[PDB]
Amino acid sequence: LANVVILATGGTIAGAAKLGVDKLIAGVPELADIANVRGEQVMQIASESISNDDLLKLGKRVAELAESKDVDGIVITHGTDTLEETAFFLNLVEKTDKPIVVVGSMRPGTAMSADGMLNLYNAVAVASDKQSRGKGVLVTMNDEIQSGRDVSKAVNIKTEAFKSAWGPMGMVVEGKSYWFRLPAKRHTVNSEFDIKQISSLPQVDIAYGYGNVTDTAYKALAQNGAKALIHAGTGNGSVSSRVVPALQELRKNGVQIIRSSHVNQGGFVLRNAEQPDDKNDWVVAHDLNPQKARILAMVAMTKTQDSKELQRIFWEY
Amino acid sequence: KLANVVILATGGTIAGAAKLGVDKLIAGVPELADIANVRGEQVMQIASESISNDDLLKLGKRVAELAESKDVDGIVITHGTDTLEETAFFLNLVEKTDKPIVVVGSMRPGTAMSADGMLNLYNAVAVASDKQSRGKGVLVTMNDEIQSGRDVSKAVNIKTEAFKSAWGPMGMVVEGKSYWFRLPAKRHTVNSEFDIKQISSLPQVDIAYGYGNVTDTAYKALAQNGAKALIHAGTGNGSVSSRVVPALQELRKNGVQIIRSSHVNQGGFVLRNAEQPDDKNDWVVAHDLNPQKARILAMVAMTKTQDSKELQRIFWEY
Amino acid sequence: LANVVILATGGTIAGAAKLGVDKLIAGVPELADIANVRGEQVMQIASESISNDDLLKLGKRVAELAESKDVDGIVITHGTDTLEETAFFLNLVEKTDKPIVVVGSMRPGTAMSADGMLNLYNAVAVASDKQSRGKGVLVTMNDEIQSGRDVSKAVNIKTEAFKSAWGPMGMVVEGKSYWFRLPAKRHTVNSEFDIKQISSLPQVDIAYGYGNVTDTAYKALAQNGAKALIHAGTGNGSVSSRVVPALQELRKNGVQIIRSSHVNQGGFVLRNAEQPDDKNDWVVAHDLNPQKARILAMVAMTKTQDSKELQRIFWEY
Amino acid sequence: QKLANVVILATGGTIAGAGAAKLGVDKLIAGVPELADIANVRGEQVMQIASESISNDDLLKLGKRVAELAESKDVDGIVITHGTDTLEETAFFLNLVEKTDKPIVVVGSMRPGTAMSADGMLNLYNAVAVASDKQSRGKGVLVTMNDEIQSGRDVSKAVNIKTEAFKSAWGPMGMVVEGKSYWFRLPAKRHTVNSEFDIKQISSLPQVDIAYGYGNVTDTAYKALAQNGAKALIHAGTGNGSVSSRVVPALQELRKNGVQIIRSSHVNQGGFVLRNAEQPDDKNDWVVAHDLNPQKARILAMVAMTKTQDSKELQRIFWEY
Ligand SMILES: N[C@@H](CC(=O)O)C(=O)O
């Protein structure tokens, strides 16, 4: 049987973030049928409260485990609120074909019809499966195999919370994986980024666009350290004429201006359509939602501050 | 006898070469005369991402004047898609008329291959002219659908199916005919407590985003710049970072309303007292309303009340 | 507390259709917090094997319970395969404002993260809520309140199985009901149909449309006693040139011809668009899928043989 | 001139309608003057039909035309204009039998070109743009409606009336915007150059028919369809390809008498039919159709049964394609 390590970080999957990883494992006795499992407690947090120091710590531990010939696959138990951020971060920085699965639950294990037991079983099943090798980071909730790149928490309350605009890649049913699509975007072994060479993360913040929005949050975020601002625009990353001149001033001051959107079910932000990105030296976030865009920007800016290069990266990952 | 419909033009891609005037929009759809007696007015000519509160009030006031007119049976507003959902919701809250009001845009300009605006505008006029539209609240007629102005949102970029509701389309409009499948459940228009005839200004309300490693910076700055309420676009069920909570408590104590929405917009809602102790902190949840929708309801509600209990009632009824 | 009766019919919700109704109720001890529950076993079937006599027996028993002063609400536990058919049938024939909720589960109770406990709790909650009165028949799976009219089993395996083209009407969360839409179509107390008058249903059958289809299934079904045929056409209820003449002959000879489709995520079939329905005296099924269209056709034909009236009905219900 | 050579094989449909199957291919091309900017476009009228009336003879004819053009050094990509009703069936058929890496795009429209805001102009432009793009090579058969790049394998007509008609349970693979292609997923199932099937070796298709499952269903349709020549039956079941107890005996007798029994469903937005779950497939020597809808399962079975009548081999095929 495969050797799978479970790194626990908290979340509702661990709600009485109360239960330790040994308790979570003990709650799924059937894990022993499909893998040789062992658990570590990396942290014990509510994921809405995650820090960049937590991401790096988790990232570095995943890398140490992926380097061990004693580990075949890795599962991370996590809160659902920022699961999608972690999953994408690991997809960019972990230079391994070994399976990495991120899993949570919408209901604590004490609730009626709690979803974590089966989610956790499926995460270990997928992490133990030869078919998962080289697929990038995966998320295994709602019987699905979702790409960590572009899966997002799209539905509140319901167990079907996690969706991608580009569909699930597969399903996991009675411990068996069934694949229907492969990834197209750069990940894990084919990434130019590596956690082994990342000691610090640049500060990236996010500001919302809406009717009657001002330049206030943009300026204030930059003044308090943002090296890049993700603009969560209306429509195709649209920017109000009131706010354009502030963003131009920010960019000249050296803040990357990355146009994302709050239009998150499909489509993407097209360069030079709604704003003159060439003239302004701005970047579009392609299909990536604001919080995903922030992750890619921050990892990218460990390597380059060149806005052309950042655009390439937003078109490749 | 054909319905008298007024088209209030505001700009948007439907008018792209916000370049074409209302008379040219109407001339572009000669089949309109088969379904209604149409006349056009240019209220403004903007890209909707650049709309101001002043612009939004001008539109609201003018809709009310035309609604009160005996020569008007329905009203169509042509509008940019970017903030169409915000305008539609605003009108839903403040226009105390049973006359149909339809807001419509397009994802492509009329110059484009397979442009969507012609049929969208025809469908808008058809719905505004239909007896079945009376008393249904503000409607949005894109993609052959009849969508509620309350909770339709621009959810898909690029594609003509851009506008979606978590609660589904209420109907369809096909070869000029309306087909209904659901009715509204939330308060609107004639059943609303709000009235644009009493509203000539709007309180400043702003939106701050939640994500990993977020700080209190944006919340503080928006309040320092005049925000009377903050919409929190949280992760998950309106969840708030432990590093933000203290600032939100400070701001609420200074009189700023704290309203928990989310960026989890395909379904579900934010539940009071679940992720945060709303009762203890005297905060409000935005129920199913996305952050921009939440901001429009908060700003309208705060013309009438600063009581967070009443605000919450309003978030549960509209 | 509301007096709720649970009428068990079988399904995976009763699997290990094995468990009796008293064991189902005992499996959710929390029901006693929210209603006074009593259970009856109406039948014990796999819903894929349901018959028209099963529908009548169930319907009649629901009508008897709705006429009782000691009953406030009724929950029917059911297999998921033909849940949508039963739900719709009851929507058409039960002339009561009392809540009627139909519920199943995708997983049996012995399974990891089984969905039946919470679905049954929610069903009782909804059946006990004054907000459910007058709403028609409801389906309460996946934390949703779905209309019995047009909810369908659209997704296999997953707990989100049940979807409507026109959206959920509400949600049920920690026992509380939250409404967002109301029904538009005729149902229950405002239906012209009543189960008290119906002794046996007309035989109606369904034939599929696809490339290189012939008239064989249509003729055989009619030969073996179909009084209407639901055409599950491609597209907008489209009919092959090789099939049209047979359907003209079958209509001439008194068989109703109802054009539905296997295009079931959205839209509707439009009269006179793909076929000359007025000339052929055929009927379109509007938005209704083939199995739902069958239910409506059977009920409708208990009142009328006039295709114009049948079309009215397909446009109102 | 460096522009890609793209041939449009017209077959009919609403894309060729007036307010179906009225306009010839020259009028289609002439209606998109911009095609000249992106490819060297030539046409051929293969047929002129409403696609709900397509035959197996029509499929073979089309397949063989596609094959010859794919073999031509003077053709870079192929576009088929088609009625939307059975577009999904043709697109999957070609994905199974065309042993080429050259782009093949199937396209239709929901509205005729005479209509307000007609969809066909842009759909055809996008089909040509995709058929001309190097990124399309090796991707299998594509469908390019609603600004999407969909897999011909598992895209289906799922929404009536609206221009977003075509959907896949597994998502769009890409989008096409201002003539440019943007990819987000790749195929996982066998297709085209990696298919074991080849139209060059198929002169005949075995007869396959489809019957529906629903309450109070009987064995009548299954028996009549087999009596009138069906070599396989696709069972369009409720739920997880579930079969009524009233029908099971009939399917066992048909199977014993040489008729393949293939369990699909009318549950088409997600999931799949799992072997041995609702019916003892092993014991009965039946096949499950996996995620494939009934009409898609019929195409696969038809093609598969040109090579094998071993139900174990047919199940392998339903799990690989
Ligand atoms: N707030 C929790 C929610 C969850 O896990 O469902 C977390 O993200 O830690």
Ligand SMILES: N[C@@H](CC(=O)O)C(=O)O
């Ligand atoms: N930026 C435009 C987009 C559109 O109308 O589609 C607007 O909102 O005015």
Ligand SMILES: N[C@@H](CC(=O)O)C(=O)O
């Ligand atoms: N075949 C079972 C499946 C289920 O209940 O989920 C039934 O319909 O009875």
Ligand SMILES: N[C@@H](CC(=O)O)C(=O)O
């Ligand atoms: N019945 C037409 C429909 C269309 O093309 O949209 C066809 O399939 O030929």
